[PDB]
Design a protein around this ligand. Structure first.
Ligand SMILES: *[Se]c1ccccc1C(=O)NCc1cccnc1
Ligand SMILES: *[Se]c1ccccc1C(=O)NCc1cccnc1
Ligand SMILES: [Se]
Ligand SMILES: [Zn+2]
Ligand SMILES: [Zn+2]
Ligand SMILES: [Zn+2]
Ligand SMILES: [Zn+2]
Lengths: 153, 153
């Protein structure tokens, strides 16, 4: 079994802890944890290509897209590997994160260890926004908090 | 070539950027950058096992030691993979880091991506300290700053 972890921090009050667990290299990854300081509603949730926080969340680069696909939602065939959709914050400003994903991996290939997890200002439209940017970024706006995905015990 | 990067952060502020570059998987890793806010003198400089900064630098665990060896200096055959010796800060509180290492890697089971880089309070005695702790930690004291080693562009 492989485990990874990510501490989300940024310029503002958004902070979080996200855990990843994978029983087998060919198996789904469970993603769980909590993010505080979010506005009520959907927040884009992505693995970005670089584990580079030198100038904050901007240095993380584009969505992790090793297979050169268009942007989509996690349940779409047409998606980036890093497309984990949205997390949902309630009026309490807290997102309780509970995701299972079959496209990200912690071992073998398409591995997200050493890449950056980002939570966004706005909803990811999952490529259903009706403009060009929808098929690239999902129009999820600014990067509120991010962290490098590290190997866990 | 393969590149990695680490943002070191801790109280002071002790703050640094460390770059890693490897031309080939069978080649040495160049490690360079700068760390500010250090006391003048030697500071232990280690890759720790977990890329887990959930509770700050303590969650990083022990020295990265995939080959089950004792603690040494980077020039020793008997060393942990994570044993990068010391960085030196001048009176300006800045350590200019310039290391070439043949034991760390950015590929394979010696790979340091997704692990934690730590700069310590005190000198690493490079296992020549003569108490027991020398052969395990090198007696380099508290963890001043750390970051997860991420994939760079
Ligand atoms: Se997860 C991954 C994806 C693509 C290429 C390499 C890896 C990887 O895990 N590399 C480090 C490694 C390889 C073999 C054994 N132990 C660690
Ligand atoms: Se080297 C390593 C260690 C832990 C987990 C994954 C890896 C790895 O090799 N990932 C693939 C990769 C791709 C581009 C640049 N660096 C690494
Ligand atoms: Se990995
Ligand atoms: Zn994003
Ligand atoms: Zn995407
Ligand atoms: Zn250490
Ligand atoms: Zn050691």
């Amino acid at each position: 079994a492989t485990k990874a972890v990510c501490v989300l921090k940024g310029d503002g009050p958004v902070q979080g802890i996200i855990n990843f667990e994978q029983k087998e290299s060919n198996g789904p990854v469970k993603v769980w944890g909590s993010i505080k300081g979010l506005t009520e509603g959907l927040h884009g949730f992505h693995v970005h290509e670089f584990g580079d926080n030198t100038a904050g969340c901007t240095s993380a680069g584009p969505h992790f897209n090793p297979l050169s696909r268009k942007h989509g939602g996690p349940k779409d065939e047409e998606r980036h590997v890093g497309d984990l959709g949205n997390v949902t914050a309630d009026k309490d400003a807290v997102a309780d994160v509970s995701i299972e994903d079959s496209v990200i991996s912690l071992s073998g290939d398409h591995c997200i260890i050493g890449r950056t997890l980002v939570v966004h200002e706005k909803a990811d439209d999952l490529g259903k926004g009706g403009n060009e940017e929808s098929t690239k970024t999902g129009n999820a706006g600014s990067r509120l908090a991010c962290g490098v995905i590290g190997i866990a015990q």
